[PDB]
Structure formats: C-alpha cells, structure tokens
Design an enzyme around this catalytic site. Structure first.
Site, PDB file in Angstrom:
ATOM      1  N   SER A 187       2.769  -3.832   3.608  1.00  0.00           N
ATOM      2  CA  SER A 187       2.955  -5.099   4.330  1.00  0.00           C
ATOM      3  C   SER A 187       2.391  -5.997   3.069  1.00  0.00           C
ATOM      4  CB  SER A 187       2.198  -5.550   5.260  1.00  0.00           C
ATOM      5  OG  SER A 187       2.756  -4.176   6.529  1.00  0.00           O
ATOM      6  N   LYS A 203      -0.215   4.609  -1.646  1.00  0.00           N
ATOM      7  CA  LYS A 203      -0.957   5.428  -1.635  1.00  0.00           C
ATOM      8  C   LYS A 203      -1.329   6.815  -1.134  1.00  0.00           C
ATOM      9  CE  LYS A 203      -0.897   3.600   3.275  1.00  0.00           C
ATOM     10  NZ  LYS A 203       0.583   3.422   3.152  1.00  0.00           N
ATOM     11  N   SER A 258       0.748  -1.584   0.317  1.00  0.00           N
ATOM     12  CA  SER A 258      -0.158  -0.506   0.391  1.00  0.00           C
ATOM     13  C   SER A 258       1.524   1.586  -0.051  1.00  0.00           C
ATOM     14  CB  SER A 258      -0.928   0.127   0.833  1.00  0.00           C
ATOM     15  OG  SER A 258      -0.641   0.229   2.199  1.00  0.00           O
ATOM     16  N   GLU A 279      -6.304  -3.249  -3.818  1.00  0.00           N
ATOM     17  CA  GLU A 279      -6.029  -4.131  -2.601  1.00  0.00           C
ATOM     18  C   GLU A 279      -6.889  -4.625  -2.731  1.00  0.00           C
ATOM     19  OE1 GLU A 279      -2.471  -2.629  -0.920  1.00  0.00           O
ATOM     20  OE2 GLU A 279      -3.738  -4.374  -1.099  1.00  0.00           O
ATOM     21  N   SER A 302      -3.875   2.710   7.214  1.00  0.00           N
ATOM     22  CA  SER A 302      -3.482   2.326   6.281  1.00  0.00           C
ATOM     23  C   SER A 302      -4.286   1.189   6.003  1.00  0.00           C
ATOM     24  CB  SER A 302      -2.207   1.134   6.453  1.00  0.00           C
ATOM     25  OG  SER A 302      -0.718   0.867   6.741  1.00  0.00           O
TER      26      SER A 302
END
Length: 277
Positions: A224, A57, A54, A151, A115
C-alpha cells in the site's frame, strides 16, 4: 509458454473489462494472472512498472529462506532494534523494541502476516540491502524488480518515479517460481513461505474479497502506498483445482493523500476469477 485457444479469446474480453475499470479509477492498473493447470492467462499492462510498496518483502523472505537451507539457525538469529527504527505500520515489531528483539523467523512472519514495515526493513538490512535483493531477483530470472529505498520511503509511489518498482508479470513469475516450483526453495521452505502468506491479515479487502464462493484459500502479499496505491500478489487455491497465480498492482491517483484503492484491486480480481473460471 503455450495456452489453450480459449485463453487467447478470454484475455481479449478481460482486457476490455480491465480498460473500463481503469478508466473509472483515476489511476493505472496492472494485472497478470495464470491458471496453472492449463496455462490460461490474462494480462493488462503486465510489463509496465508499478510501485512495489512492501510487496518487495516476498523476495526478501525468500532469499532468507534460501540462505537458511545452508545456514542452519538463520531463522533463529535474534535482531535487536530501537524505537527510532520502528517506522509507520509496524504492529508487531513495535512491541519488541529495545533489549528483547525478534528472531529472523518472527520478523518474516510479522512482515508477511501484518505487513510490518519495520520487520521488512530489518530483514532487508540483514540480507545486505536493496542491491543484494535486486541481485537475487535477477538470479531468479526477474529483470524488472528494482528496489532502491526501504520503508516508509518505498511507499511514496510518486507518479512517473521508476524507483522501487516491478511489473505484474515479473512478480507473477516470481510467486510461481518461489512457491510452485523447486528451482529456488526446497520443499520445507516453500511450505513455510506458503504458510506465512496464507496467514496474512492485510488482504481482506483485495483478492480475498473477490473469491466467488466459500472454500478458497489465498496466500498473498499486499502493498500500500500514497497516490491511491494498492497491490496484492497471491497464489490462490480454488476448490478441487490446481492453483492460480494472481498479481495486481494499482497506482497513480492524485492527490498524494488518496487512500489505497482496495475496491479497484477487488474488482480486478473479480475479472481475473471470471476469466479463469
């Protein structure tokens, strides 16, 4: 760019420490870090591709902030979504599915401070998708950023898969350009992006865990994924010092279920802070 003579020597010493940490790790480590006061710098695999997870972002929120400079009220636009769109690791957006929705600014805060994966997806759709985000990366001088999926699939981090990757140096340069220079975002927008990243709650075991003393602040962006993947990119604000920029990517441990190797990122950051002291 130029660096002091001491930086050339220290980079060689840091590289030996990074090599040893990586050799112990089961995976592959990438680091780029800059002391902005004088250009001292350390790099390790700085131009290799690593799964972003991520960390994309940062560019998504930056593009929305850039657009908000001309589109008044962009941050107040409300986006609605159903439970079916709430993907794993969505601690904020899971509370507002259905009729309530969230504003673009609230989604940006959720993405950068928790996140929130669904928030990242909703912002990515709002801006026009991965290809539009890649074009923005290219427009700010980043020829490495390559987002393909959203995602949770972006977090798959399959060893050898070059989709959904960037390099540590490319991300370091983006963090510097978006937060510490005036060519992309205006002063109010840089301040908002910094404030969101200073408030991140997902970085306590990574760069923040390595700061050597009290009185430091960290504005960061974590990622992650599977295969041990743990990333952290930040501006670091030491006491009585100009900022540091630090980008750490770590990946590639089998099996797939190996948890993010936060302790490796922590130690890599310790090496960085020692080199840049």
């Amino acid at each position: 760019r130029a660096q002091p003579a001491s930086s050339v020597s220290i980079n060689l010493a840091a590289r030996e420490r990074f090599e040893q940490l990586e050799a112990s790790s089961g995976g592959r480590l990438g680091v780029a870090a800059l002391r902005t006061a004088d250009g001292s710098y350390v790099g390790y695999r700085e131009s290799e591709r690593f799964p972003m997870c991520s960390t994309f972002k940062l560019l998504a929120v930056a593009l929305i902030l850039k657009r908000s400079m001309a589109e008044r009220g962009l941050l107040e636009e409300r986006i609605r979504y159903g439970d079916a769109q709430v993907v794993a690791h969505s601690p904020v957006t899971k509370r507002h599915a259905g009729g309530e929705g969230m504003t673009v600014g609230e989604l940006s805060a959720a993405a950068l401070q928790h996140s929130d994966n669904t928030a990242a997806n909703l912002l990515l759709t709002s801006l026009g998708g991965p290809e539009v985000l890649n074009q923005f990366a290219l427009s700010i001088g980043d020829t490495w950023f390559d987002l393909v999926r959203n995602e949770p699939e972006v977090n798959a981090s399959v060893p050898g898969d070059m989709r959904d990757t960037t390099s540590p140096r490319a991300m370091l340069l983006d963090v510097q350009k978006l937060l510490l220079a005036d060519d992309v975002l205006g002063a109010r927008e840089r301040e908002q992006l910094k404030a969101w990243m200073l408030g991140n709650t997902t970085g306590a075991t990574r760069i923040r865990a390595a700061v050597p003393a009290a009185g430091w602040l960290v504005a960061d962006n974590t990622g992650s994924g599977d295969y041990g993947t743990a990333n952290d990119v930040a501006v670091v604000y030491p006491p009585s010092s100009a900022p540091l920029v630090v980008a750490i990517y770590f990946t590639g441990v089998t099996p797939k279920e190996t948890p993010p190797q936060d302790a490796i990122v922590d130690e890599a950051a310790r090496i960085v802070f020692d080199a840049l002291r």
